[model samples]
Structures are given as structure tokens and as C-alpha cells.
Target chain A: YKKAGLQRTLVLIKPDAFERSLVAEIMGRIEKKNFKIVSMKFWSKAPRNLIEQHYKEYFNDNCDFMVSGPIISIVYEGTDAISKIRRLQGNILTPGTIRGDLANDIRENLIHASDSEDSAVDEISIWFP
Target chain B: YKKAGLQRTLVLIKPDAFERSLVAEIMGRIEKKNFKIVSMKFWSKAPRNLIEQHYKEYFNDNCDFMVSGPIISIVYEGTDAISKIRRLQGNILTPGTIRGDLANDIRENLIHASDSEDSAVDEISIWFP
Candidate 1:
């Protein structure tokens, strides 16, 4: 375990973000908010099982969209990171947060942030393990 | 144009670092230390004029090497950001800093951080403007 109540969260800069060259803009917001990216990778295509497992509730569309182009997977570490990122992402279907400001389509939100600490752990393992 | 004694500095993830996929690693360090990336861009190749203007003291060699591959340039903003980033970078030819820990050759030191606030301003204008 770590000290000082530090936490880690998973983030996926989806294909739309990369295809439009928005990596720096979104990541700039994260860094500006004082979160640290502990691990990251650029994927031309994610593993089928990984994507399937990640969005099991909406497997088909989510998986296909994710694998359509390059995406960036990241693990951000900080205090209350899961919630911080969640708020930064804004409403899943709204337009004021990252998704709200940068994305229009509900299914094509520009980024994915873990919703909770437990799920963050599970998601990090899926992507980093 | 900003507030609260905030400052901005220029950073360059060199070609060698990009080729080795160390973009997140180095930028992570910056974020972990609480600096903010306010502006950033990935250059498949930098313009000859830009590189030459930025590295006038060693224009020929530095410009050639910089154009050899892709690089990531950023403008980081925060309090005393220039000095903070300079310290984080460590000795240009030593191993205890970013260059020291991650690079074996002085010439391939993986990152470039402004040595002074004035230069930071100048460089940011060059890369961002």
C-alpha cells in the first residue's frame, strides 16, 4: 500500500482525441490540475479481450470504436484521482467538461476516466498488466 | 497575461526520447512535481527556421539533430516554473537528474528545459507563437 492517501486512476484518450490531435489539450488539463501520469502507452489497436472486458455492458460498439484508430492509455496518480478525473470529464452526455467541451457524440466522448477507486484498480490491471 | 506570479517555460522531448517512447515518462515527472503543461504539440519535424532560431548558438548541429525525428514541445505554466523544471532536469552532463538518470550520452539527454525565465519566455514564444 502507499501512504498519504494517494490514489491512481485509469484514463483512455479515445481514438477521436488522437485522430483529431487532441492528446496535448486533454493531457494538458490533467497536468494543469496537478495529476501525474504514472504509466502510458500509445496503441494502434487495443486487444479484443481487453476492450471487451472493459466495456462489457456495451461491448460491441465500444470495442469497435476503440479499435478503430490509435488511442492513448494512461494511469494517473494523485490524491482522489478517480473522482477528480471524473469531475474533469464532466457529465457523460454533457458539454462543459472534457467530454462536454470536446466531444458531441455520447458514444464518442473524448476520454474515459475510471469511476471509482475499486474500478480504477481493476481497469489499471486490465490495461497495464 | 496570467496571474499570481505564474510563469511559463519551454520544454522539448528530444527525438531520442520519443524514439524510445519516453514521452509520458518525462512529462509524468513534470506533472508529478506539480508543473502544468499549458501548451504542447508533437512535431514530426520542426521547421528549419524555428529550430535555427531556437538554437542559434549551436544552430547547425542542433537543428540537424532536432529535425531528424519526431519531438514533443510544450509550454509549462506555474509558479517559478522555469527554475523548478531546470532543477528537475538536473545537470546537463550528469546522471542524478532527468538527463543523468535516463540518458547515457550528453548529446542525447532526452529533454530540454529553459535555464532562465527570460529564455523560457523567449522559447515559449518561439514554439507556441
Candidate 2:
């Protein structure tokens, strides 16, 4: 469902994102900002894997918080989506940016915004495929 | 996941319950009827004093006709919770029940029912404490 030249970016709205109901609001904002949502779905990260993956590069293994719930995953496609979405997401540790800023700390930060274009593709394919 | 004659309930779907889409289908038709919500945590209404004060009760909280978002809170402390649930939840409330009557408004409604006394106690404790 992606057009050529349009990079297909993978995004994980994390379990916290779903918990906060920011899924629709954030996605709507993305759409309003002119991005296209190519796909969306809900899946529970297995308890142990949920914590490990959610805070893998972000925090220590003390991630019992993440193992507690399910997450919403999405793949958005558009122009400059990688940079655009990340900037829109802001720092993941702060509580001001869409991700870090508005969300709780990273342990429960609303989502995991891909850090690069290549990673976006890799993550998308990994989760989608 | 349920039992009979034991009222152990700890329920809290939280304020975001309405936002996430995780509510119900998890709980289902108890939304039916007869099962009354003993207590409800709602921003649906404000105090008269607070209303008349500088904080004029903001209108259109949901803006798009969204009423109290998903609220299915209850406390069933009786020997016959199943019967009570079916009894109190009027036909107009739950789907599997009579109140499945008007399912149009998808924004806000309160639904809190118990499976049985034991489940009531267990769920209450699990959710509450």
C-alpha cells in the first residue's frame, strides 16, 4: 500500500500508547499533518518479551511495567516520514514531545519512534512480515 | 476465570478505559441490563459550585457527541450475582441482554457487573487493591 519514493516507515505505538488512548489522537494528528497510515494492528507482546523489548536499548531490565500490557503497532508511509515522525515524536525521555514530552518516562513512554529510515524499514518488515 | 458465591471484586478500568478500545469484548453483555454500577468515576459532571465558578463546565468534552467514555464499574456483593447482573442490567444496557437495545451511542455509559460472588471478590481485589 506504499507508493514509490514514499518511504514506508514502521512505528510502534507501544503498550503505553494504547493505554493512554493517544493512538487515535496521535495518528489523527499525523494524518492531519499530512501523513498516510498504511497499516495498523493490535498485538500483545508476550509478558517477558514485552518488558525486554520495550526497554531494551532504553532502560534496565527492571521493566515489569511494560510486561504488563499489550501494544499497538503501525506502519505509516509518506514523504520524509522518518524524520517528520521522529521530530513530531520528540525526545522519548521528556514529557513534552509527542513521545517523550507528552508521555510518562521512557519505561512507559507512549511509544517507540524509529530513529532512522533504515531502522524504520527493518522494524516494519520485522513486525509486519 | 469465574466462580460462584464469592464476592471478591476489584474493578478499575480507569479514565482512559473509553479511549483505548480494550474495554469490553473483554467484559461484554453485562453491559446488558439489570446489573447496576454501584459507583462510577466520571468527569461526566461537575459540582454546581465548580460549574458556576470561573471554570465554566466546559461543553463538548468529547466534542463529537462523545459522552462519558467507557465506564463499566460495579460492585456486586450478593449471593446471586449472575441473577443480579441479569436482573439489574435493563434490556437497554447490555448487548447479550435487553439494553443491548440502543447500541448507537458509542461514547459513554457505565457498566459494572460480576460473574459470581467469588469472581466478584477476586476481580474486585485484583482491580482495586
Candidate 3:
């Protein structure tokens, strides 16, 4: 059971990570897990409109914090990167995961990784394209 | 002895750091040491002119590799930050420091920190101004 070739997924390092200077801590976790950074970008403050588009539920008008501070968008390449990264960024209940270990609260969950292949494709386009 | 005010220092995360996906690992070290990131920037490739200006000795034509890939420039704040950070970015000879733990050859030191008050002031102005 081997997965051949590379899979690319988008990781959005949200404002919470940057605000707490956890950007590297979180990224370090991924690096330690052997993921490769394909490309990355930083914005002191992301545009409101861009955040709006990414979170359709921002359709609910909840994206104010995302544009409050800095954010880093990264593309990671690895086998099974999408799901594997999710495990690393587990929900607030998962003790060893990024959110469980470093996030301040469920509301300010620190990092965002794609949940599926289709979303990964759609997410990369929004940020990188 | 209690240090009174916040001091700032400049850190250059070199191309070697970026190429190896060690940016976060390195930053995590700074964060774990409790340094505050005052500002940061990432360049896919730093301009040759800026690198030259930073090392007037790059007038020595030694900056070819610097412009070959990504770089991150950072300004960190803390009490006695200039010298404190140097300890964290210790030269290749010091174990437990950033270079000793993660850097490869001495030829491609992964991080650079300003050495003194005057140089910290001068270096931050170069990258941040």
C-alpha cells in the first residue's frame, strides 16, 4: 500500500498563529513531519474581500479577525498531505495536534488545511491564483 | 539584573533556511525563546542590490547564492534582544543554538543576527526601512 507521486494542499496560517508568533511553531511541525513547502506568501493583513470569498460562511460575516493581522499562505507537497496535515491540525479535542497544543480557543483555531482533494484544488486557486 | 526597555534586533533567514523548509523550525526556536516578532518580510529572491548594501563587502561579489531562492527578514523585540538573539543564533561552534542544531555546512549558515546595538540599529533600518 503505497501512494505514489506528490499531493499538494493549501495551508492557510491564520491571524491567530501570526499574532501569537506561532507561525513557525506550526510550520515547524509540518516540516518535522517531512512535508515540503512548495510555495508560500505572507500578507500583513489579508483583504476582506479575499477572506469573504474563501469562507462562504463568511457569507455569515465572521471573517473580521482573519484580516486583523498577518497571515501566511503555504502550499505543501507530500504523499497524503491533505489528510495527513489535518491530523496534525486536529480539532480542539485532539491533544497532540496544532489546535489542541497551541491554539487559544476553538474560535481562534490556528491553522487551516484542506479537508479534501476538491477543496484543496479550490483553496489553492483562491490563495495562489 | 533587570533590563529596562525593549531592544530590537534584525534577523536574516537565509536561502539555505528556506530551501530546507527550516524557516518555521528556526522561527519556532526564536518563539520558544520568547522573542516577539516586531516585523517580517519574505522575498522569493532578494534583490542583488540590497544584499550588496547589507554587506558592503558583498562588494566582494559573494551574494550570488543569496538571490537564488527565498529569504525572510525579521525584526524581533525583547529585553536585551540584540545579544540575546545572537546566543540563539550562535555560530556553528555552539551546540543547542540554531546553527549548531540545524545548519548544514558553515558555508551556508541558516540564520544571521546583528551583533551589537549599533549594528542592530543599522541592520533593521536596511531591511525594514
Off by over 4 Å in 2: A1-5, A46-63, A92-96, B1-129
Q: Which candidate model has the greater TM-score, 2 or 3?
A: 3
With a 3 Å backbone cut-off (N, CA, C), the pairs that clash in candidate 3 are: A57-A60
Task: Compute each candidate's TM-score over C-alphas.
Answer: 0.48, 0.42, 0.48
State the DockQ of every prediction.
0.02, 0.02, 0.02
Candidate 1 lDDT over A1-129, as tens digits, reads 221227889999998888788889888766644567789988888877888888766557677998898888999886667876787787555543677668878888889999998899999999998
Output the worst ten-in-a-row residue range by lDDT, candidate 2 chain B: B46-55
**Candidate 1 per-residue C-alpha lDDT over B36-102 given as tens digits, one digit per residue, 9 for 90 to 100:** 6688998898887888888876557767888898888988887998898898887433323566345
What digit string (tens of lDDT, one per residue) describes model 3 on residues A8-35?
8999998888778888898987765556
lDDT accuracy of residue B5 in candidate 1: 36
Q: What is the interface RMSD of each candidate, in Å?
A: 15.9, 19.1, 10.8
lDDT at B26 for candidate 1? Answer: 90
TM-score of only chain B in every candidate structure: 0.89, 0.33, 0.90
- Please write out the lDDT profile of model 3 over residues B1-129, one tens digit for every residue: 132338999999998777777899899988877888888999999888788878874334458777777889999888889999898987543335677445434547789999999989888888999
